[PDB]
């Protein structure tokens, strides 16, 4: 792989998360029934694939050279929170505070990985 791929995947997840946050808020304000098999399920499946490939790349990144601000446990925690964030953006059952907490957690780790990449890619 190239750090370039990881970076793109990182930015893709950030966008999924930010667009997800807006979808969540819009759903709480004025609910809309999203289709399960045609929209929700495929969104989770696609993002599940994205998250897995990202994690493997992120983990590779930290093994080759010990990064300054990102560690394994942090990378591993993204998956479950990210997937919950995706599902809830459509069904929005969880409360505002909880949605914010997982979104904040996911975004920070994503930004951290992004920072490490840029820092090490610039030598």
UniProtKB/Swiss-Prot annotation:
It holds the Pfam family DUF1798. InterPro entries: YppE-like, YppE-like_sf. It comes from the Bacteria. This is Uncharacterized protein YppE. It comes from Bacillus subtilis (strain 168).
């Amino acid at each position: 792989m190239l750090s370039q791929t990881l970076l793109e995947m990182t930015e893709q997840m950030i966008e999924v998360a930010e667009k997800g946050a807006d979808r969540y808020q819009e759903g709480k304000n004025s609910n809309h029934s999203y289709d399960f098999f045609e929209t929700i399920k495929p969104a989770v499946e696609e993002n599940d694939e994205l998250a897995a490939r990202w994690a493997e790349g992120a983990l590779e990144l930290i093994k080759v050279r010990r990064p300054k601000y990102v560690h394994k446990e942090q990378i591993e925690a993204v998956k479950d929170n990210f997937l919950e964030l995706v599902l809830q953006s459509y069904v929005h059952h969880i409360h505002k505070k909880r949605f914010k907490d997982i979104t904040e957690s996911v975004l920070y780790t994503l930004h951290a990985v992004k920072d490490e990449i840029a820092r090490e890619d610039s030598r």
